Amino acid sequence: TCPFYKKIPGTGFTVDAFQYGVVEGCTAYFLTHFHSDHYAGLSKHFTFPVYCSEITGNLLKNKLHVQEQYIHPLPLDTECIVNGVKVVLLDANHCPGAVMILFYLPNGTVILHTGDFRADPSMERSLLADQKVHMLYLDTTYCSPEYTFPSQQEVIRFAINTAFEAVTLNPHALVVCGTYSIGKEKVFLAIADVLGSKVGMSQEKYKTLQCLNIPEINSLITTDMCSSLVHLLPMMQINFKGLQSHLKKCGGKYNQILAFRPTGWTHSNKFTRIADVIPQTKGNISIYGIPYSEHSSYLEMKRFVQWLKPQKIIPTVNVGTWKSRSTMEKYFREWKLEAGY
């Protein structure tokens, strides 16, 4: 059954609630973004209204075959009325098409649901600046001070400089990037751009990227693996065995692989700066784990919530253990005492 933190009180609405069958009393289902833990359950057989961004709606239609008559895309930054209730979609700074949802309840209560997000000061000058928020349904993925990582721009600078140096030293090196979902496209796009290549990938991944409104994509991506020296592979193949096997398939065009595995946070963040990151190497294969996150660091999260000053916080991540819930609640009270709300 649908958990309480997916239900918006005072409405008929749910958020990211497709894996529970028909939800009792739900008249409209919102989807914040196209990640499988959130869309799980959607198909051609779904016959209730789904509200989402334009990009998420293109993905629903083409990848899951949801019928067009049930897809209700909404423009961003625009007040819309859904089943009698004013809503706004805002950019979440997560993966392509990902949104936060502002609900203006009939009784005067204002609710923000972040979906998954990477908090940023730029959000302090969106339509959030203009009213009070009573309830915040918060992506608490990295809600503890140990979770530190660099800016996405510093991680991309490292990746571009590493790839450009390796291929300039050896024009016969191949670059490989791992993926398993949408998001983190800057990693493979910025490396291809510095090297003067397109990114080569499977037909299924190409189809997924063509759903995304990224300008000049016919320009950066391809299914012709032979024409490309940046290849995208499933994340499970980014290991010495899978990479050795890929290099055989390339028919003697290449004699070295440099690979990237974008992860979120890992514990080597506690000890090493991005500048000082080194690979794992076996023979002519080197693998870099790079901390490219599409979720808030602790500090970014704390800044956003201290600016917003909500009256009540509802965590949507790490809710399954008493120790996780108690730790998160202790941090929310510190933040509130420090900032004075």
* 11 contacts: CB under 8 Å, gap ≥ 6: 83, 85, 103, 105
Q: How distant, in Å, are the alpha carbons of 34, 86, 220, 263 from that of 28?
A: 17, 13, 37, 34
Residue placing its CB nearer to Ni ion in the complex, 13 or 34: 34
DSSP secondary structure, 209-239, as one string: HHTS--TT-TTTEES-GGG-SEEEEEGGG-S
- Which part of the chain contacts Ni ion (CB under 5 A), choosing from 12-20, 111-119, 234-242, 303-311? 111-119
Residue placing its CB nearer to Ni ion in the complex, 186 or 309: 186
Size of the site for Ni ion (CB under 5 A): 2
H or E element that contains 99:
strand 99-104
Which of the residues 219 through 278 are near Ni ion (CB under 5 A)? Answer: none
- Side chain identity at residue 320, one-letter code: G
* 283 contacts: CB under 8 Å, gap ≥ 6: none
- Which part of the chain contacts Ni ion (CB under 5 A), choosing from 6-14, 22-30, 39-47, 112-120? 112-120
Which of the residues 140 through 179 are near Ni ion (CB under 5 A)? Answer: none
Q: How far is the CB of 297 from Ni ion (least distance, A)?
A: 16
Residue placing its CB nearer to Ni ion in the complex, 116 or 185: 116
Q: How far is the CB of 32 from Ni ion (least distance, A)?
A: 8
Residue placing its CB nearer to Ni ion in the complex, 32 or 162: 32
Residue placing its CB nearer to Ni ion in the complex, 142 or 254: 142
The reply on whether position 116 binds Ni ion by CB under 5 A is yes
3-state SS, residue 263: strand
Please list the residues that pair with 37 across neighbouring strands: none
Distance CA 285, CA 206 (A): 26
* Contact yes or no for 339/309 (Cβ under 8 A): yes
The reply on whether position 302 binds Ni ion by CB under 5 A is no
Residue placing its CB nearer to Ni ion in the complex, 116 or 300: 116
Q: How far is the CB of 173 from Ni ion (least distance, A)?
A: 32
Binding mask 34-73 for Ni ion (x = CB under 5 A): -x--------------------------------------
Distance CA 59, CA 43 (A): 11
The reply on whether position 16 binds Ni ion by CB under 5 A is no
User: Which residues of this protein are in contact with Ni ion, per CB under 5 A?
Assistant: 35, 116
